Structure 1
Amino acid sequence: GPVPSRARVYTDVNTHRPSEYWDYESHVVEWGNQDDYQLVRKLGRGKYSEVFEAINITNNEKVVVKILKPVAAAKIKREIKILENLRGGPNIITLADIVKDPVSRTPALVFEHVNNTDFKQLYQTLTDYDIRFYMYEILKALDYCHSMGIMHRDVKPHNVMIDHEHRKLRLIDWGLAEFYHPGQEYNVRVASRYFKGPELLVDYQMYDYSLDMWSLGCMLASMIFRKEPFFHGHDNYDQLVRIAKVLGTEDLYDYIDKYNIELDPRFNDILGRHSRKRWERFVHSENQHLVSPEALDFLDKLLRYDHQSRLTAREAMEHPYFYTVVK
């Protein structure tokens, strides 16, 4: 069987807290008035919710209303508890109200409004300074939630709202977020394909906060190399092959050896043999101004197969890559 693993930081934060903090099933929802909000336009639809721009007609303030689908309506108590526990934290989306949608009959979450710019238009238009500035802002949010015993589990560009005009950032969609308990085996069907950590791809269930740091590394590689996404898998199996063509197969085998994991035998006919690549192979005339020795050292310390060997969010904030950022 697989060898157990524990987070190297914030290991026992939930073991000391009173049951009320992490026992989300026991939480009682204080429902507000849905008629306080007037829906303006549909912003988007996912497999778990529909998002709307709305107006709070009492104070004329712009808000965002997230109406959960019945499939996600089952684990509403987890998302509500997490959002309340993290409320006021640096760069964390602020939950303003919870109401009962009259049409879906499911809960609807009301949030503060952020004037976001499409990442497919922004993230790939930033300067070297701005990439460093916004990465530091994301790290503030990740260290905060990890210090409060929570894993985000869906870090990706679409989950980071940025008001580039005001230089304001918010980490959103805490629908897949979970409380970290040492020794707990978790569902590997989390995060979006391109941002899934190797622990998920090899079906290793005893993962931790370090999963968010792999996802952050994928975001950084895409920004500094101008390649969207960086690891472009056709499916979950091809996703691991794309990673192995860059990081090499020897360190992958060492990883699975260390944790006594048995790879799905379907990998025997698709993985092949690959040496680790130097990051200069991805540098070209169009992205060279975004690349520095500090950016490459930082990336090297996030994109590691071994989840225990990755920089934590606090260690990442100490990195020379951020020395140029005004604090």
Structure 2
Amino acid sequence: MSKARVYTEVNVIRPKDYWDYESLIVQWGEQDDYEVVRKVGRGKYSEVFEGINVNSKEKCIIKILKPVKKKKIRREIKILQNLCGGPNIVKLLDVVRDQHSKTPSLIFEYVNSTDFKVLYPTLTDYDIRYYIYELLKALDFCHSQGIMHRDVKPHNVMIDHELRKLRLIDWGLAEFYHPGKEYNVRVASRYFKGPELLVDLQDYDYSLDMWSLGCMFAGMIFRKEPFFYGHDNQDQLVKIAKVLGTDELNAYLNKYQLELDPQLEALVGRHSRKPWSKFINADNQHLVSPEAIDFLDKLLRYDHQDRLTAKEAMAHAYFAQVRAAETSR
């Protein structure tokens, strides 16, 4: 079986009540202490509003969880409480519920987000280095708490470009890492699913989040988001294989003793690894550097054991000056 290279035993050492979200008894707050002000988003499982504290009027975010199973409600709540206060994690402020319908609501800090479709074309070489570093600080922290995010994507990375604050949000797909556990591969979003999700490798770890970050980083520096534009889960692996090459995919399949479907094998075919320099053009050359390619190259690997950890990534030469500006304080 496969185990994480780092933070392998966190949930083994911690007391059971840290990761046993099934047995969590929520201590709810007064639900009438908040009221919606304007609907701000939606989803398959919730409907998030810009709320407002009834007293302070101070704004917030009210994520009203739809009829989901109580086991998944407790999981997201327990993860948000374990990660509260960590660097660049969205701050859970309160947890309330109706008392009549038992419908729960998660109260978050408000973030003056700029949607990635609007913000990303205006990001510079320095902006990308800074924001990816802030996102790496969030991933390293949650990995150090024995938790995988499993839904890293631009829609879940809130950026207030005026204050240059970043917040990793949406933890409804997050899970505790237990060594040797077989997880559901129906996680994350199509364009950011790691190869392990597309080949049914169920004993994945924190490195799944590093692949998703790699897809984001590729789409940013090449100004081609989504970078792997697959039309379904099978075509997603095909889009990956024509970039990374099939010969390293075959080695990946042989190592973990996996096998592709007869149908999927016909679509993947045989392909040479494409050099990252082939994706440079006049519109994105100002964002692409040799350090950027080396850092990207060490994230997008079939074998999840060869991907950089978050801490290994923060130490890459691509982030040298960002660390210089950070240590100066």
- Same-fold call, TM > 0.5? yes
Q: Which residue of 2 aligns with 1:198?
A: 195
1:250 to 236, 247, 252: 247
CA distance in 1, matches of 2:261, 2:98: 43
Q: Structure 1 72/117 Cα, relative in aligned 2: closer, same or farther at 3 Å?
A: farther
CA distance in 2, matches of 1:105, 1:18: 29
CA distance in 2, matches of 1:72, 1:141: 27
TM-score by length of 1: 0.97
Matched, 1:17 2:14: yes
Q: Provide the aligned length of Structure 1 versus Structure 2.
A: 324
CA distance in 1, matches of 2:124, 2:144: 30
Matched, 1:161 2:158: yes
CA distance in 2, matches of 1:75, 1:263: 31
Q: Which residue of 1 aligns with 2:37?
A: 40
Matched, 1:272 2:272: no
5 Å matches for 1:171-320?
171-320=168-317
Q: Which residue of 2 aligns with 1:144?
A: 141
> Which blocks of at least 5 consecutive residues in structure 1 are unaligned?
none
Give the structure with the higher percent helix.
2
- DSSP 3-state at the match of 1:123: helix
Q: Structure 1 167/47 Cα, relative in aligned 2: closer, same or farther at 3 Å?
A: same
Matched, 1:96 2:104: no
CA distance in 1, matches of 2:101, 2:92: 20
CA distance in 1, matches of 2:100, 2:298: 48
- Deviation, 1:269, is 1.8
Matched, 1:128 2:122: no
5 Å matches for 1:63-78?
63-71=60-68, 73-78=70-75
TM-score by length of 2: 0.97
Which runs of at least 4 in structure 1 moved beyond 3 Å after TM superposition? 101-105
CA distance in 2, matches of 1:158, 1:138: 13
AA aligned to 2:36 is L
Q: Which residue of 2 aligns with 1:62?
A: 59
- For the aligned residue pairs, the C-alpha RMSD in angstroms reads 1.1
- DSSP 3-state at the match of 1:324: helix
AA aligned to 2:150 is R
- DSSP 3-state at the match of 1:116: coil
> Which blocks of at least 5 consecutive residues in structure 2 are unaligned?
none
CA distance in 2, matches of 1:102, 1:7: 41
Indicate conservation of the 8 Å contact 1:95/1:111, yes or no.
yes
Moved more, 288-297 or 103-112: 103-112
Matched, 1:6 2:35: no
How much identity, in percent, do the aligned residues show? 73
CA distance in 2, matches of 1:50, 1:104: 16
